[PDB]
Design an enzyme around this catalytic site. Structure first.
Site: not given
Ligand SMILES: O=c1ccn([C@H]2C[C@H](O)[C@@H](COP(=O)(O)OP(=O)(O)OP(=O)(O)O)O2)c(=O)[nH]1
Ligand SMILES: O=c1ccn([C@H]2C[C@H](O)[C@@H](COP(=O)(O)OP(=O)(O)OP(=O)(O)O)O2)c(=O)[nH]1
Ligand SMILES: [Mg+2]
Ligand SMILES: O=c1ccn([C@H]2C[C@H](O)[C@@H](COP(=O)(O)OP(=O)(O)OP(=O)(O)O)O2)c(=O)[nH]1
Ligand SMILES: [Mg+2]
Ligand SMILES: [Mg+2]
Lengths: 193, 193, 193
Positions: B111, B115, B124-128, B136, B138, B172-174
């Site tokens: 957060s 801000r 793209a945030h899913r770690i499989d 990685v 972006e 790891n297997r695909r």
């Molecule tokens: O924030 C991220 C999200 C994913 N990955 C890695 C983790 C994940 O398991 C993999 C595949 O992600 P995704 O299916 O979204 O990417 P793709 O472009 O479709 O590659 P693949 O063809 O290997 O699915 O890439 C990262 O390094 N950072």
């Molecule tokens: O959409 C959102 C997401 C989060 N927050 C609040 C909820 C959450 O519990 C807190 C902390 O979020 P996060 O850990 O991502 O932020 P940080 O910058 O790392 O703060 P901290 O040091 O408090 O963890 O901020 C919001 O106000 N709006």
């Molecule tokens: Mg994929």
């Protein structure tokens, strides 16, 4: 708890979860099913209006949305959509998805796309219990290079999460739900609120 | 359902997932583990190419990708990476992460960062399941000031979600998996589709 | 899992989860509760500083943070905030939310918004166990039209995921947590890292 690939295959087999056309086993792995891009797109035309009033009078909002949304763009064979840096466009998945009331779905983009600046949604990637229809996409190219998008490409992925129980008001039975029966690159229905 | 902090440390102790190096107890709380910034980055070279045809001839796209991507940037310790508004960049987390076949991981930014307009991923945030490797990032600055990024800063958080069971085709297997063994700011491999 | 709409109702009725003012039955459906726009905003005054060094001398940072953030903008009865394309702004929900130690919250925008390019968060949408406060929003207009935003409009939705166990370090108790007691458009506190 997300469904792993074997369980997605079984939900698709019991049939209360449907994805039409159903991606093959090659496209169901880990905890996701891949989805593809359709051929419907929409762009915006700012020169017609100063702004859109998200909460202004319903009537005037409907007029505005109509002046800034292009009509649906359908690409002829071999044609690409050129998505340029900085230029929001609507699209749709090839697949239609239907979720039972005890399941929610979540759309991801693709790491391969992220790494070129391609967002597939604009902080709204939740496919509700009761949902039935193709899934609208909001593309934003945050990158440095235009991207040619072609219908058919692997554009995103769906994960699925059984809910604590059957939603008592699922999307299909909800009276003010905006997008039931969705099928192309349907423009914002914010004027319905 | 996500692992609470205590369970995260419990999965770490019993080797059911790995985080290397393992963040201290200060960085594991609620339902997340904070991750830190690595020191490998990549930028884009727009002038060398007109566009990228995501699903075009493999040799073309592959070459284009190699044209527009910078060599990997390694900061001399003390050095900052200045991320200007409007300027997508690739990076990597400090930590390596390894996930079993019955768990999916999800990357969050912070957060405090949000801000200031810093996105850490582009939808793209899913770690499989079966994933093993540095993650990685972006970076896109959607805000109004340049932000200096230095290695070792807290850049995001991971939360972990057990699956309905063990995935039958984990990463790891695909064999058409794109980024196994990723240990740097690796470019998009979209040509590999 | 996430709580189906009923179960959300259960937890509000039980009382460890709380949302004030409690949204009516109508804005609780599927797997989410709808949340509304507050009346407090902040903008960025870029000309006062060259950059922000996310992990520099604490001193430096706060002052720069102080110089770039506007005075809070408070909208009175019947007023609009105009979010123009490319102009990051801070805002807040109308609702105050409290999560128990064994629950995690997740913020989404709205598809109706997404299709006009409004992001409501910048890769930071996790609402932590132990959280008690109004939720800060990071608006980015990625579309082509300015959008008028009025206090009280439907701006987003929350879904809830129970944890595997009660967090040992939930937000309200964690000594270095930055945002407890959040009751308005609070700026980044990255300088407290
Ligand atoms: O924030 C991220 C999200 C994913 N990955 C890695 C983790 C994940 O398991 C993999 C595949 O992600 P995704 O299916 O979204 O990417 P793709 O472009 O479709 O590659 P693949 O063809 O290997 O699915 O890439 C990262 O390094 N950072
Ligand atoms: O959409 C959102 C997401 C989060 N927050 C609040 C909820 C959450 O519990 C807190 C902390 O979020 P996060 O850990 O991502 O932020 P940080 O910058 O790392 O703060 P901290 O040091 O408090 O963890 O901020 C919001 O106000 N709006
Ligand atoms: Mg994929
Ligand atoms: O990426 C997405 C996300 C959602 N939707 C659909 C699925 C979902 O179940 C529905 C409603 O989403 P949401 O509640 O976020 O949008 P809304 O603007 O609030 O519409 P409504 O009034 O129908 O809730 O729109 C898509 O087509 N693509
Ligand atoms: Mg945090
Ligand atoms: Mg909705």
């Amino acid at each position: 708890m997300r469904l792993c690939d074997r369980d997605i295959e079984a939900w698709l087999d019991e049939g209360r979860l449907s994805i039409n056309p159903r991606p093959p086993v090659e496209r169901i792995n880990g905890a996701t099913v891949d989805v593809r891009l359709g051929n419907k797109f929409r762009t915006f035309r700012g020169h017609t209006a100063a702004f859109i009033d998200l909460s202004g009078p319903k009537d005037e909002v409907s007029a505005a949305l109509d002046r800034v949304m292009s009509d649906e763009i359908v690409l002829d064979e071999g044609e690409a959509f050129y998505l340029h840096p900085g230029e929001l466009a609507l699209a749709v998945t090839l697949e239609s998805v239907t979720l039972p009331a005890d399941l929610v779905g979540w759309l991801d983009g693709r790491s391969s796309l992220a790494r070129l600046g391609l967002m597939v949604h604009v902080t709204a990637h939740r496919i509700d219990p009761g949902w039935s229809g193709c899934i609208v996409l909001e593309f934003y190219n945050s990158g440095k290079l235009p991207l040619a998008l072609r219908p058919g490409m692997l554009i995103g992925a769906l994960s699925f999460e059984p809910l604590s129980g059957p939603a008592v008001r699922p999307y299909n039975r909800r009276e003010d739900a905006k997008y039931r029966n969705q099928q192309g690159a349907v423009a914002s229905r914010i004027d319905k609120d």
